[PDB]
């Protein structure tokens, strides 16, 4: 029994973990074979964070102008090369030890576990999800760039987040690891802020399923509701649209519990309207969305 | 910025977790140096569990009978032994992983990461606190015996944790690597329940200082309290009391928010008395008291 928040081991990720210098401006790299993966804003000053030329930046440096270290060894860079938003840093050394991996590309919505890192060591690992206006609600400090996240389903790490920056509200804005960002953000020190954020409607509805199958059934009601009418009521509480897509994807939690999707929407409108008078969820006095349907199946019985 | 609920990074200990059944039981063990620890339920059957006699299960069982899997490779059990409710398990392989390591045990109020297992294959890690009635808030499922809960100071694992056991409430009880159980408990089908609760104040505490550094101020206020009259309305409000030791551990966040501790206390009656009228404090809509001084301090720098 019991629901907690919960990252993936970190280990594969630890043995990838290096620190990448340029200049005076220090931060993380990800270590996979024998290329070095980091933010491309390395090569700038705070003065070129304002409208950095990043191809011009990147063709007046060398081979050594990059200091990779992978605990207390240096590793030399033997070339370098630059896609999206990402450096692409060549090594004379394979890392031993390479997971299988693969690079993914993720959605709002979905979860992945973060392992922050200062200085190429592992700090803390958490777990954190893709919000719909594309930011995450991450923990990073000074010197945090190049963290990236993942999941370990089976044992092949797949990698979705590198982090670059923090926003002014305090979340945090980042890459896959081909280097593009996540929403509309941009690797250079302007007004960009993000969008409104919103509930990810599908992920509270899997935590409520989650909530029936530890066996609590206090905020089920007798009613139902149309699709279209549930969504007419979640844009007024700033939850995201729930589309056929989500109800499908909800299917195996309804069937083992019991509940019809929409059954379930009932009962979050009513939660919506109502608060939770004094009772909690799971631990918790808010409704939470920061677990998927896949989450949910993975921890609970 | 940001803060989240962080565990520790856990390689070091993915790399310690084996698989050990004796007959058809099988649970998770800890394989450090050539011993493997796990617990020592693992020795039972069904009927045992009514009423065992450990010493007796234990002297009928022989080498032989404890296999033992470091992932696909089979370890040679050469020795068997029991410290309090811990299997020592002798191999005839030091483990090539084995990472500096202390077994400690905690106090209530401390906070962990648990590795959790099954089938000595980790599955998950989260963050738990040490509760006051000595149980912790888990996500464990048939299976998860022997996973381990563990700090990480500097190089070196403290292991301070061993799962053993869920109670009726659906939390969760263990001992220490020496086998001295968290609480009143024992490894026995017996009636067991978690006592009440109390919430641990200088951990509420902690939080509202990282709410503080995380620009969360409203319930900041003009007042200032003694720990006398603060722990009048502690005790009224199933909070541990507030002791001068507590005060001092909150010395560097006093410092660090300008806010002395009997002040952010008032803030704290305040909250206790009133509520929080609709506001939240770091996202959360009640008081967090999993995270110790030292964790705020270590994630805030
Ligand atoms: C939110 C603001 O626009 C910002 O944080 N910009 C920035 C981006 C990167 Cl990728 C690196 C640095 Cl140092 C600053
Ligand atoms: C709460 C109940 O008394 C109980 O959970 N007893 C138990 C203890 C151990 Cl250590 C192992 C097993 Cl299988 C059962
Ligand atoms: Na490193
Ligand atoms: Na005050």
Same mark, same amino acid.
């Given at each position: 029994?019991?629901?907690?928040?919960?990252?993936?081991?970190?280990?594969?990720?630890?043995?990838?973990?290096?620190?990448?210098?340029?200049?005076?401006?220090?931060?993380?790299?990800?270590?996979?074979?024998?290329?070095?993966?980091?933010?491309?804003?390395?090569?700038?000053?705070?003065?070129?964070?304002?409208?950095?030329?990043?191809?011009?930046?990147?063709?007046?440096?060398?081979?050594?102008?990059?200091?990779?270290?992978?605990?207390?060894?240096?590793?030399?860079?033997?070339?370098?090369?630059?896609?999206?938003?990402?450096?692409?840093?060549?090594?004379?050394?394979?890392?031993?030890?390479?997971?299988?991996?693969?690079?993914?590309?993720?959605?709002?919505?979905?979860?992945?576990?973060?392992?922050?890192?200062?200085?190429?060591?592992?700090?803390?690992?958490?777990?954190?999800?893709?919000?719909?206006?594309?930011?995450?609600?991450?923990?990073?400090?000074?010197?945090?760039?190049?963290?990236?996240?993942?999941?370990?389903?089976?044992?092949?790490?797949?990698?979705?987040?590198?982090?670059?920056?923090?926003?002014?509200?305090?979340? &945090?804005?980042?890459?896959?690891?081909?280097?593009?960002?996540?929403?509309?953000?941009?690797?250079?020190?302007?007004?960009?802020?993000?969008?409104?954020?919103?509930?990810?409607?599908?992920?509270?509805?899997?935590?409520?399923?989650?909530?029936?199958?530890?066996?609590?059934?206090?905020?089920?009601?007798?009613?139902?509701?149309?699709?279209?009418?549930?969504?007419?009521?979640?844009?007024?509480?700033?939850?995201?649209?729930?589309?056929?897509? &989500?109800?499908?994807?909800?299917?195996?939690?309804?069937?083992?519990?019991?509940?019809?999707?929409?059954?379930?929407?009932?009962?979050?409108?009513?939660?919506?309207?109502?608060?939770?008078?004094?009772?909690?969820?799971?631990?918790?006095?808010?409704?939470?969305?920061?677990?998927?349907?896949?989450?949910?199946?993975?921890?609970?019985?």
């Amino acid at each position: 029994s019991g629901f907690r928040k919960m990252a993936f081991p970190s280990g594969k990720v630890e043995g990838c973990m290096v620190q990448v210098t340029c200049g005076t401006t220090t931060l993380n790299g990800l270590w996979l074979d024998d290329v070095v993966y980091c933010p491309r804003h390395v090569i700038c000053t705070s003065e070129d964070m304002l409208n950095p030329n990043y191809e011009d930046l990147l063709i007046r440096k060398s081979n050594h102008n990059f200091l990779v270290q992978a605990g207390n060894v240096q590793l030399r860079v033997i070339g370098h090369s630059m896609q999206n938003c990402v450096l692409k840093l060549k090594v004379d050394t394979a890392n031993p030890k390479t997971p299988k991996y693969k690079f993914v590309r993720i959605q709002p919505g979905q979860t992945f576990s973060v392992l922050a890192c200062y200085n190429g060591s592992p700090s803390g690992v958490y777990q954190c999800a893709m919000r719909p206006n594309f930011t995450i609600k991450g923990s990073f400090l000074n010197g945090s760039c190049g963290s990236v996240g993942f999941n370990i389903d089976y044992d092949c790490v797949s990698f979705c987040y590198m982090h670059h920056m923090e926003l002014p509200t305090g979340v &945090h804005a980042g890459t896959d690891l081909e280097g593009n960002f996540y929403g509309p953000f941009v690797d250079r020190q302007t007004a960009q802020a993000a969008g409104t954020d919103t509930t990810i409607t599908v992920n509270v509805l899997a935590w409520l399923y989650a909530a029936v199958i530890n066996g609590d059934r206090w905020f089920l009601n007798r009613f139902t509701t149309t699709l279209n009418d549930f969504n007419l009521v979640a844009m007024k509480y700033n939850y995201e649209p729930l589309t056929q897509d &989500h109800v499908d994807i909800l299917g195996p939690l309804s069937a083992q519990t019991g509940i019809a999707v929409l059954d379930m929407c009932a009962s979050l409108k009513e939660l919506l309207q109502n608060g939770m008078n004094g009772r909690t969820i799971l631990g918790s006095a808010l409704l939470e969305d920061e677990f998927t349907p896949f989450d949910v199946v993975r921890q609970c019985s």
